[PDB]
């Protein structure tokens, strides 16, 4: 049973996952995903969420006063506050497993140059805060990363949704001049396992030598 709150200036972006949820898991009270528009907590008529960085430079920084108010309302001491950022600790499958047993995740989607650092610093004095990167590239905002995180975590929550894996094949046995490797149709399951292991080894060497 997990509650996920997402805070973003683009709430419509998160509507796919809101619809990716089986009705059964919602009605069983296994999962709830709520999305909140950050501008609800702006306090000027122009609904400002960012401002120029101290120390100069191009880019805008999201205002601590706005985020502070939002997190104050949404978070509790039990919350795991997740902040996607290219400067974060690596988000991996191990991370997803760990977070899959959390009761309350709040994902704070930043944009532009990022969120004023005091927001996370302040939050960290009364809840668990995790700045995480989903990969070594740069996006415009945290929303796509939030989708990845939500999907990776929730698919590990029962009933809600190393080497590289080798190739897989299904019907038909012959297609556009290409046959399924005959070993897979051999009925020798020890030999099939060894073939797949070697395929995995070769693919890992070729594509991800870092994993060795």
Judged by CB under 8 A, the chain residues 83 through 142 that form the site for its own copies are 86-93, 95-96, 111, 113-118, 121-122, 131, 134-141
What is the four-CA torsion angle of 10, 91, 93, 28, rounded to 10 degrees? -40
CB under 8 A: which stretch of 22-30, 36-44, 58-66, 75-83 binds its own copies? 58-66
Q: Choose from its own copies, ligand JET, none: what does 32 bind? Cβ within 5-8 Å by kind.
A: none
Between 77 and 170, name the residue whose CB sits nearer to ligand JET: 170
Q: Compute CA distances 175 → 135, 179, 196, whole Å.
A: 36, 6, 21
Between 30 and 164, name the residue whose CB sits nearer to ligand JET: 164
Q: Shortest Cβ distance from residue 55 to its own copies (Å)?
A: 3
**From the list 39, 68, 98, 127, which residue makes contact with its own copies (rule: CB under 8 A)?**
68
**From the list 30, 34, 127, 148, which residue makes contact with its own copies (rule: CB under 8 A)?**
148
Residue ranges of the alpha helices (H) in 20-178?
Answer: 23-27, 64-74, 93-99, 117-123, 143-154
Helix (H, G, I), strand (E, B) or coil at 131: strand
Between 31 and 134, name the residue whose CB sits nearer to ligand JET: 134
Q: Is there a cis peptide before residue 154, judged by omega within 30 degrees of 0?
A: no
Q: Choose from ligand JET, its own copies, none: what does 176 bind? Cβ within 5-8 Å by kind.
A: its own copies
Residue entry with tokens 């960085």: 53
Q: In what order do the strands lie in the sheet with 61-62?
A: 50-51, 61-62, 114-115
Write the CB contacts of 160 (distance below 8 Å, at least 6 apart in sequence).
Answer: 21, 22, 25, 30, 31, 154
Please indicate if the annotation marks 185 as binding a ligand. Answer: no
**From the list 14, 17, 142, 153, which residue makes contact with ligand JET (rule: CB under 6 A)?**
142
Q: Compute CA distances 63 → 122, 185, 208, whole Å.
A: 13, 61, 40
**From the list 9, 134, 149, 154, which residue makes contact with ligand JET (rule: CB under 6 A)?**
134
Between 1 and 22, name the residue whose CB sits nearer to ligand JET: 22
- Contact footprint for ligand JET (CB under 6 A): 83-86, 110, 114-115, 120, 131, 133-135, 137-139, 141-142, 145
């Amino acid at each position: 049973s997990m509650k996920i709150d997402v805070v973003t200036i683009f709430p419509e972006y998160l509507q796919p996952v809101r619809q990716s949820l089986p009705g059964k898991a919602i009605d069983a009270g296994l999962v709830d995903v709520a999305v909140h528009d950050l501008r609800r907590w702006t306090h000027d008529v122009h609904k400002s969420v960012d401002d120029s960085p101290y120390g100069g430079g191009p880019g805008m920084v999201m205002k601590p006063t706005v985020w502070g108010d939002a997190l104050d309302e949404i978070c509790t001491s039990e919350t795991l506050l997740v902040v996607p950022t290219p400067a974060g600790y690596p988000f991996t499958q191990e991370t997803a497993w760990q977070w899959s047993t959390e009761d309350h995740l709040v994902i704070a989607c930043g944009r532009y140059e990022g969120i004023d650092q005091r927001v996370a610093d302040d939050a960290a004095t009364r809840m668990r805060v995790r700045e995480v990167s989903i990969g070594d590239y740069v996006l415009n905002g945290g929303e796509a990363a939030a989708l990845v995180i939500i999907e990776a975590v929730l698919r590990l929550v029962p009933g809600v949704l190393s080497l590289l894996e080798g190739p897989s094949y299904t019907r038909p046995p012959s297609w556009r001049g290409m046959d399924v490797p005959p070993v897979l149709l051999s009925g020798d399951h020890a030999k099939i396992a060894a073939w797949r292991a070697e395929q995995s080894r070769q693919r890992t060497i070729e594509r991800r030598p870092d994993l060795l």
